[PDB]
Structures are given as structure tokens and as C-alpha cells.
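[worker-b] picked up task from shared queue
[worker-b] task type: protein-ligand structure
[worker-b] ligand name resolved to zinc ion; SMILES cross-checked against name lookup, match
[worker-b] sequence length check passed
[worker-b] input payload:
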Amino acid sequence: FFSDVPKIGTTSVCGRRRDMEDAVSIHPSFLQRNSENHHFYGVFDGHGCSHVAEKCRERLHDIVKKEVEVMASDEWTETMVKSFQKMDKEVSQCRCELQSPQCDAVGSTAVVSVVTPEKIIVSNCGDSRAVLCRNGVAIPLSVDHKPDRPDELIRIQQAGGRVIYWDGARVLGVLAMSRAIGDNYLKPYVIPDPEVTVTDRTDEDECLILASDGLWDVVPNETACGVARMCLRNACSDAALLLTKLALARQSSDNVSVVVVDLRKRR
Amino acid sequence: QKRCRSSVVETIEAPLPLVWSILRSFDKPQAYQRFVKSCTMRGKGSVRDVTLVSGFPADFSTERLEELDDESHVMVVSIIGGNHRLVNYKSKTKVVASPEKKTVVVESYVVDVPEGTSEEDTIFFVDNIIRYNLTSLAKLTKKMM
Ligand SMILES: [Mg+2]
Ligand SMILES: [Mg+2]
Ligand SMILES: [Mg+2]
Ligand SMILES: [Mg+2]
Ligand SMILES: [Mg+2]
Ligand SMILES: [Zn+2]
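[worker-b] inference finished, payload out:
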């Protein structure tokens, strides 16, 4: 009676920047497990150049897929961590035209969510974010990797690094996030290891919003969901579009990437 | 005005004239400075406009060539504008052949300690950057030859 696949809306723009270093990966029905249809969504905020963000857009779902085909029961944390580390490995081995020394300062955040019939899996590394709207409430499904996040501050010092405020809390004074894909020159302080949440789908779930800090740096979780909430009253693409426009209206000088996955059943 | 100074010394496994030919190129810091996205140059007095890559905590530098001696292999640069909280920055680069073919580079500098940050963090911040550049220099020379 209803649809197994979700309606998704995407808006990914250069904004006031010269170079687009955001990338977006949309792979609905990308696999089946125990006769269950799985979905892949991912946002990547690049820095230094665009190529690491693009690379994730081109490989990450494949890598997650191969890892899923070998996972026991429901061990999604292990699956996502392995996938993320494997992505980083591949990057280890275009503006910068893949040339030194400039390719030696490139990485990407990666926020991705596999949506199964029963669960929402969010695997995050960096300061992009996944936020669930449900019962009107804005529920973050990831926690930004900021060098001054107290547990992140301590992990960095334990890797022998330091955090210096220089236009914001920064790892070694350089990078504004404590985790990322690539950026080998900043290992072991900045690692590609993601943190993973797993949350049961409810009847109260409205939509999932994956987005780069182009969005969250100016629009908070509560007002994002509110915009998405009314658009749903392509609605998802109307929400994605309205959200990026809002961030630009709040004078975002950064690339902006918003993905809106519809979670409730339809058709 | 609070001020700090530091120095980085590294040994590079490449011949002096190779290494120097790269360092002396004021107009092309991009060759070994990873955070440089672009640089246009307008001998002594030359001013260069640097743009910095995304991710870095600044977007531009404006730097002036104070001295270039190809006899003693010394360069003197001074940042005269920028977005990088580095005020009154002035640096010397000394290159010498190794008494053992290898090259030693000494890069030293003075700069104002920015408001709100310790001397030690300022030192660490700049030293760290210099080591990156000297690391890339080594990589580049290793390639060219
Ligand atoms: Mg970026
Ligand atoms: Mg296992
Ligand atoms: Mg960004
Ligand atoms: Mg931000
Ligand atoms: Mg910039
Ligand atoms: Zn590149």
C-alpha cells in the first residue's frame, strides 16, 4: 500500500565561493540485506581542494556496500568505521590537479546515513551534521568533531597534538575540525574514524536532514526542522532548497549542501 | 608590543644550488608551501600577493622581499598585510651546503604575539608551518632529481 523507498530532495551549491568543495552522494535502494531494501545518503564538505570530497561521493557507498555484504547480525558501528577507514586509505594512495605540495593539504568531512526498514544509521566524521525531525523535536544524530569538544580536546593531546585558538579552536592552529577523511599530514591528531549512531525508526519520524556546516553555521537544528516541517505539510526538494536559501539569506559565504530524506510512509 | 622569535633548522638531502634555486623564487612559494593556493608578484622591494587554501585560518598574505643575496644564500621576507594574525612578521632564510650532497636550511623570524594568544602558541603555530614547508621542499627536491 505504501512506498518502501523515500522521497529525497537535494540542493548543493557553490554559494558565494569561487570553488565548489562540497559533494553529495544519493543512492536509494543501493542494496538489500535479508530481503530488506537499504538506502545510502552522504554529504562531504571538502577543504584544501575538492577532490577528496568528490572521491567519497564516488566510492563511499560502494565501500559501505561491500562491508555490509560481510557484516554479522547488526554490527553497523564496525561496518561504518571499517568503511570510513578504507575510504581514507584509498585517498592516501581538480584544483590542486593532484599535485604536491597542495594535494598534501586536502581532506573532507563525511556524514552518511544508511536507512533500513527498521533503523537509521548515522556515521559521522567532521563537522557536517545529521539531524532527525520527529514529534516536532530536533534530534541531532551526530555530534560535530570540534577540536574544543572536551573529549575531542583530550583525545588530541593523547595523540601528542595540541589545540590552538586561531580564528577558532584548531588542531595545531590549522584545522577547524578534529576528524576528517584524508589530511594525512595531520594524522594522528586528526583521524578518519567516525562516530556512529543507530536509532530505531518510529511512527513519529518526519524526515532526516544531512547537511554541511554551510547550513548549520547559520541555521540551528530547531529552525531547520521547522522549515522542513512545513514544506512537508518535491516537498523534500522544496525543503532542501528553502533551507539553503535561508542560509544564504543569513549571508553564508560558504558552499551549502542540504539533503532531506522523507521518513514517513506514502503512496 | 609583545614580540616573539624562533628558528627552524633542517637538513635536506639535495645539493645547495638545487635547494636555493627553489627558495630564492619569491614569486613561487606555491612550489613547496602547501597552504599557498595562488601567488602573484608585482629583487628587493618586490611585493607578492598570496592567497591561502580553504581550511587554513586565513585567506591572504601580503609580503615584501627585503633582501635576496645569491652569494651568501640569504632571503629576507616581511609580511606587511594579511588575514593570519601575523603582524610585523619578518623572516630570514639562510642556506648553506652541508660540510658532508646535502643542504642545511635555517629559517628564523620575529613577529608580534597576537592579542589573546600566548608566546608559546604563536611559536608553535609558526614553527609547525615552517616544518611543513621544509618537508615539502625535501619532497620536491627528491622528485626534481
Ligand atoms: Mg569546505
Ligand atoms: Mg566482525
Ligand atoms: Mg564548509
Ligand atoms: Mg563552521
Ligand atoms: Mg579561504
Ligand atoms: Zn585536488
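[worker-b] attaching auto-annotations
[worker-b] The first strand of chain B starts at residue 3 and ends at 12.
[worker-b] releasing lock
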